[PDB]
Design a protein around this ligand. Structure first.
Ligand SMILES: Nc1ncnc2c1ncn2[C@@H]1O[C@H](COP(=O)(O)OP(=O)(O)OP(=O)(O)O)[C@@H](O)[C@H]1O
Ligand SMILES: Nc1ncnc2c1ncn2[C@@H]1O[C@H](COP(=O)(O)OP(=O)(O)OP(=O)(O)O)[C@@H](O)[C@H]1O
Ligand SMILES: [Mg+2]
Ligand SMILES: [Mg+2]
Lengths: 362, 203
């Protein structure tokens, strides 16, 4: 038994020795080089804000650390120890890594023209970028999926994110806003820096009107800070530095409140309207959302669609859910057309509490 | 020398830690780019006493004050405002204490409780349970009373937000409050979130 006993003890020995070696190491202050002075003096600013002139430990290949490069200054002498790659904020990391479920284009109904416009803007320019060169244009960069609530804008964005390969950055415009000074604009700058670093990229901003609202001439300090964020965003899209292979998608249901500079054709090139489902769109959505429901009758989807006038995709999904609710309440392990009719009338009654939904840009 | 190695490790790992984040995890051998609550970004050539493959950008860690070496991984941050708005001492109001509300109860109870306990009905019928229940009512009736009864009779994680609690200055706040509330409800076992006086926030 001593063999295995001492083997495990030696494994724990290696672990503990590694732990002690780590324990005998101290951290280093990350800054960015500003300029090189005399081959041994570098003006470096620590991220905390102070600026110093510091030395450089020898094996650093001074050519590798140029103005703007992240470096690790020693915590005591502040001398450079190693150059680092550009930082990726934890926010931008999780933005890139959010899971858009596994939504497929087969889960979206009436949106066919809109789907192909979005794909025209996103996919083809990033896969065959020479057709547009031949025709003599620079393919559109920005999309505005605007429409009434629950018409499928976020579902379409999720489908695109799941079904395309290029890098994708998920973000709700209200989850960029921070109370610190300049933090939101800095976060947007880091978004676009990450996008440029990973050149084939898409940036989806859900409910953009959180940030991209109209600019107030009499707003508060908070409004002015959010407007600074908006203007940083506008400069990033169509400012001095051109954007290559980075596309923007922005979803909204109050496009009338967006800044005209944001709605400008140069920034949000193609504004596509995810309108309320028409007759055929309602039929398609109802089939999509009633496919998995165990129906045991003859379903006049046409009648359901006729009574579903003015509904949205979420309303039709709720029609299916309410038919199921009626089934359980009746203690039935299936659904029928009487249940579907009751559900659609219930949702129609619920729709009476809404307000204006036909909001358009410009 | 396991004993003495652990002794030295404990001496270095004595409290108090400084809680920082793991904003970036670089490969060079793995290194950290932590940012500490003193608002100071420190690059750690050696991550420390916690496994490298257990840290992801943004998670909360404990760090040595001087060496700034990661020592522990700490739970997620929930504003003490989003923890203080969780129901611990459950209300006590049986549905029998409710008056002329029977259909309204039945409807709520269904949409909320049934997907929690009898999810098998939903799964076998191939349905997505109803998501949100909005209780409109004139200034009277039994909206908050029924919410109290549900929280008392549910035996789940109940989180009473109220409306004007989520409206704050310091732009970003309020949104952070909502995000933290929903994240806490998600991490906890099946949970309800009660928005009292929704029109304060949903205008
Ligand atoms: N065209 C559609 N086809 C299928 N399902 C749809 C469609 N439109 C909406 N839905 C359903 O609506 C719910 C998701 O809606 P989604 O988040 O896409 O809405 P939205 O248009 O972005 O609205 P909001 O303005 O409220 O954010 C899901 O139930 C999805 O099935
Ligand atoms: N149907 C009812 N049965 C029993 N008590 C009721 C009923 N409706 C109201 N009450 C009484 O009303 C008081 C609390 O009302 P509650 O907080 O539920 O109102 P609400 O619907 O949330 O309205 P609001 O906040 O606009 O005043 C308690 O005394 C409760 O007993
Ligand atoms: Mg949406
Ligand atoms: Mg109330």
């Amino acid at each position: 038994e001593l063999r295995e006993q001492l083997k495990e003890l030696t494994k724990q020995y290696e672990k503990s020795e590694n732990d002690l070696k780590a324990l005998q190491s101290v951290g280093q202050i990350v800054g960015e080089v500003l300029k090189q002075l005399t081959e041994e003096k570098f003006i470096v600013k620590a991220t905390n804000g102070p600026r110093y002139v510091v030395g450089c430990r020898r094996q650093l290949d001074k050519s590798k650390l140029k103005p703007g490069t992240r470096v690790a200054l020693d915590m005591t002498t502040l001398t450079i120890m190693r150059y680092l790659p550009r930082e990726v904020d934890p926010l931008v990391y999780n933005m890139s890594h959010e899971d858009p479920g596994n939504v497929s284009y087969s889960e979206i109904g009436g949106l066919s023209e809109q789907i192909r416009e979005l794909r025209e803007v996103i996919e083809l320019p990033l896969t065959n970028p020479e057709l547009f060169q031949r025709v003599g244009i620079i393919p559109p960069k920005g999309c505005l999926l605007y429409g009434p609530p629950g018409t499928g804008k976020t579902l379409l964005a999720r489908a695109v994110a799941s079904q395309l390969d290029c890098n994708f950055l998920k973000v709700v415009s209200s989850s960029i806003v921070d109370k610190y000074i300049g933090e939101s604009a800095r976060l947007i700058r880091e978004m676009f820096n990450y996008a440029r670093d990973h050149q084939p990229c898409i940036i989806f901003m859900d409910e953009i009107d959180a940030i991209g609202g109209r600019r107030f001439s009499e707003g508060t300090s908070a409004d002015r800070e959010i407007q600074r964020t908006l203007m940083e965003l506008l400069n990033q899209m169509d400012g001095f530095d051109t954007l290559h292979r980075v596309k923007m998608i922005m979803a909204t249901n109050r496009p009338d409140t967006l800044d005209p500079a944001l709605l400008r054709p140069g920034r949000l090139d193609r504004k596509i309207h995810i309108d309320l489902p028409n007759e055929q769109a309602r039929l398609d959505i109802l089939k999509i959302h009633a496919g998995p429901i165990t129906k045991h009758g003859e379903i006049d989807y046409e009648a359901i669609v006729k009574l579903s006038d003015g509904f949205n995709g979420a309303d039709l999904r709720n029609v299916c859910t309410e038919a199921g609710m009626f089934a359980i309440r009746a203690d039935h392990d299936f659904v029928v057309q009487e249940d579907f009719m009751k559900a659609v009338r219930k949702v129609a009654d619920s729709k009476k509490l809404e307000s204006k939904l036909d909001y358009k840009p410009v | 020398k396991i004993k003495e190695n652990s002794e030295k490790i404990k001496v270095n790992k004595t409290l108090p830690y400084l809680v920082s984040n793991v904003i970036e995890l670089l490969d060079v051998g793995k290194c950290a780019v932590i940012k500490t609550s003193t608002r100071q970004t420190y690059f750690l050539p050696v991550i420390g006493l916690v496994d490298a493959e257990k840290l992801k950008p943004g998670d909360l860690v404990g760090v040595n004050k001087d060496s700034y070496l990661i020592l522990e991984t700490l739970p997620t941050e929930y504003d003490s405002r989003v923890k203080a708005m969780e129901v611990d001492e459950r209300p006590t109001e049986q549905y029998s204490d409710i008056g002329g509300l029977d259909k309204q109860i039945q409807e709520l109870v269904e949409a909320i409780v049934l997907p929690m306990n009898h999810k098998e009905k939903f799964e076998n019928l191939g349905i997505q349970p109803p998501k949100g229940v909005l209780m409109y009512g004139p200034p009277g009736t039994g909206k908050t009373l029924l919410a109290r009864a549900c929280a008392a009779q549910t035996k789940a994680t109940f989180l009473k937000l109220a409306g004007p609690q989520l409206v704050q200055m310091f732009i970003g706040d309020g949104a952070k409050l909502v995000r933290d509330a929903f994240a806490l409800a998600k991490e906890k076992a099946p949970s309800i979130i009660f928005i009292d006086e929704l029109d304060a926030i949903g205008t």
